[PDB]
Design an enzyme around this catalytic site. Structure first.
Site, short mmCIF file in Angstrom:
data_model
loop_
_atom_site.label_atom_id
_atom_site.label_comp_id
_atom_site.label_asym_id
_atom_site.label_seq_id
_atom_site.Cartn_x
_atom_site.Cartn_y
_atom_site.Cartn_z
CG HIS A 41 -0.52 0.44 2.46
ND1 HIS A 41 -0.43 -0.45 3.50
CD2 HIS A 41 -0.17 1.67 2.91
CE1 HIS A 41 0.02 0.24 4.53
NE2 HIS A 41 0.17 1.52 4.23
CG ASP A 90 -0.47 -3.68 2.90
OD1 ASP A 90 0.18 -3.27 1.88
OD2 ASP A 90 -0.78 -2.94 3.88
N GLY A 190 2.39 6.13 8.86
CA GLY A 190 3.81 6.42 8.72
C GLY A 190 4.68 5.28 9.19
CB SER A 192 2.41 1.83 6.51
OG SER A 192 1.09 2.00 7.00
N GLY A 193 4.60 -0.67 6.66
CA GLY A 193 5.72 -1.34 6.01
C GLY A 193 6.82 -1.78 6.96
C1 LIG Z 1 -3.82 -0.13 3.95
O1 LIG Z 1 -3.70 1.06 3.10
C2 LIG Z 1 -3.24 2.19 3.66
C3 LIG Z 1 -3.03 3.23 2.74
C4 LIG Z 1 -2.51 4.43 3.23
C5 LIG Z 1 -2.27 4.65 4.61
C6 LIG Z 1 -1.66 5.98 4.95
C7 LIG Z 1 -2.35 7.17 4.68
C8 LIG Z 1 -1.79 8.42 5.01
C9 LIG Z 1 -0.52 8.50 5.61
C10 LIG Z 1 0.17 9.79 5.97
O2 LIG Z 1 -0.47 10.70 6.47
N1 LIG Z 1 1.50 9.86 5.68
C11 LIG Z 1 2.34 10.99 6.12
C12 LIG Z 1 2.86 11.72 4.86
O3 LIG Z 1 1.85 11.97 3.88
C13 LIG Z 1 3.50 10.58 7.07
C14 LIG Z 1 4.42 9.45 6.59
C15 LIG Z 1 2.79 10.08 8.34
C16 LIG Z 1 4.43 11.76 7.42
C17 LIG Z 1 0.19 7.32 5.88
C18 LIG Z 1 -0.40 6.08 5.58
C19 LIG Z 1 0.47 4.90 5.88
O4 LIG Z 1 0.76 4.08 4.88
O5 LIG Z 1 0.88 4.69 7.01
C20 LIG Z 1 -2.53 3.57 5.47
C21 LIG Z 1 -2.35 3.68 6.95
O6 LIG Z 1 -2.58 4.71 7.56
N2 LIG Z 1 -1.85 2.57 7.57
C22 LIG Z 1 -1.95 2.23 8.89
C23 LIG Z 1 -1.12 1.23 9.42
C24 LIG Z 1 -1.27 0.73 10.72
C25 LIG Z 1 -2.26 1.26 11.56
C26 LIG Z 1 -2.46 0.85 12.89
N3 LIG Z 1 -1.75 -0.14 13.45
N4 LIG Z 1 -3.39 1.44 13.70
C27 LIG Z 1 -4.20 2.43 13.22
C28 LIG Z 1 -4.06 2.91 11.91
C29 LIG Z 1 -3.08 2.32 11.09
C30 LIG Z 1 -2.93 2.76 9.76
N5 LIG Z 1 -3.00 2.38 5.00
#
Ligand SMILES: COc1ccc(-c2ccc(C(=O)N[C@H](CO)C(C)(C)C)cc2C(=O)O)c(C(=O)Nc2ccc3c(N)nccc3c2)n1
Ligand SMILES: [Ca+2]
Lengths: 254, 55
Positions: A41, A90, A190, A192-193
């Protein structure tokens, strides 16, 4: 990471920071000198495939201390079963343009065998999750790498002790829940991955990838992680294959 | 055998015909003569933290 602590410099040596045009994108996990595992993602919105950089040996984003090693990402390999904008399958396998040099600050995490991971690692209750992600829901990201110890749940138990929200994605056999439902501790946007690393008899192994959740550390919810054991054979086969032109590669899964 | 307590292996376990079991290790490790333990063969084996190992 919400409710964790700073990972002492060099104690998370497999942690990767992924950057696009120099900006924070996602985390990842180094599994040998040239391969990094991350989340599919993280690549949904990439247009600048040539400006994707992995940084190893990173700790504090505000200073360069000489332990950092940057590499261009030559290839991003995603399972054919992954659908952009969704949560299932993912996982991404990243080939670095040149290997990183192993040092006290840059060390791969062991990618375990499938049987070992399903029969043994899957029953180790606590594992570490790490990243430079948001410190709070709708909050600032961390300047220093953060780490958190989280317990793993059986999916039946995760679904049962979770508050129904509506339009909430299903937890498949390619995922697992880990964390706390009391709104105190979780990985976040942030992170993520990044790795979900499990200790067994003096050695750490890759068991999960920070994937998704419904708000960071929200009451009645756990963090959802990609179940790495489902992809061992897929990853091993790709690591034995020759690079192909073009950064993005969709590879059949299984 | 491998199903129960990882067949006593520190790392990987392989089941064989009858009551036969072989432990194995990840690359960068070798199996000790005890047939269960794994020892590093390289300076930076996977899944070990150097600053903690050197302490
Ligand atoms: C699956 O597709 C997706 C697609 C996109 C996002 C996603 C959406 C927005 C952002 C974000 O705001 N990024 C920023 C820059 O634009 C940053 C990196 C924080 C500075 C970051 C993510 C990300 O990949 O972490 C996410 C996401 O927010 N992932 C997660 C992962 C683990 C989580 C967790 N363990 N608890 C609550 C929320 C959680 C959200 N998931
Ligand atoms: Ca730094």
């Amino acid at each position: 990471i919400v409710g964790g602590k700073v990972c002492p410099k060099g104690e998370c040596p497999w942690q990767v920071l992924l950057l696009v045009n120099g900006a924070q994108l996602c985390g990842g996990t180094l599994i040998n000198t040239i391969w990094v595992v991350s989340a599919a993602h993280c690549f949904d919105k990439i247009k600048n495939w040539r400006n994707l950089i992995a940084v190893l040996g990173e700790h504090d984003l505000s200073e360069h201390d000489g332990d950092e090693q940057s590499r261009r990402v030559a290839q991003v390999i995603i399972p054919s079963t992954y659908v952009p904008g969704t949560t299932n399958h993912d996982i991404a396998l990243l080939r670095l343009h040149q290997p990183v040099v192993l040092t006290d600050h840059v060390v791969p995490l062991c990618l375990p065998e499938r049987t070992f991971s399903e029969r043994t690692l899957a029953f180790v209750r606590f594992s570490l999750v790490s990243g430079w992600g948001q410190l709070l829901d709708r909050g600032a990201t961390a300047l220093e790498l953060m780490v958190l110890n989280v317990p793993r749940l059986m999916t039946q138990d995760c679904l049962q002790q979770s508050r129904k929200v509506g339009d909430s994605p299903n937890i498949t056999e390619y995922m697992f829940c880990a964390g706390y439902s009391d709104g105190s501790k979780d990985s976040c946007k942030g992170d993520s991955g990044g790795p979900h690393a499990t200790h067994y008899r003096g050695t750490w192994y890759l068991t999960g990838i920070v994937s998704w959740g419904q708000g960071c550390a929200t009451v009645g919810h756990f963090g959802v992680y990609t179940r790495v054991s489902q992809y061992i054979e897929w990853l091993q086969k790709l690591m034995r294959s020759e690079p192909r032109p073009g950064v993005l590669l969709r590879a059949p899964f299984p | 055998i491998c199903v129960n307590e990882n067949g006593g292996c520190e790392q990987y376990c392989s089941d064989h015909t009858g009551t036969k079991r072989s432990c194995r290790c990840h690359e960068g490790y070798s199996l000790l003569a005890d047939g269960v333990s794994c020892t590093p063969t390289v300076e930076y084996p996977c899944g070990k933290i150097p600053i903690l190992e050197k302490r």
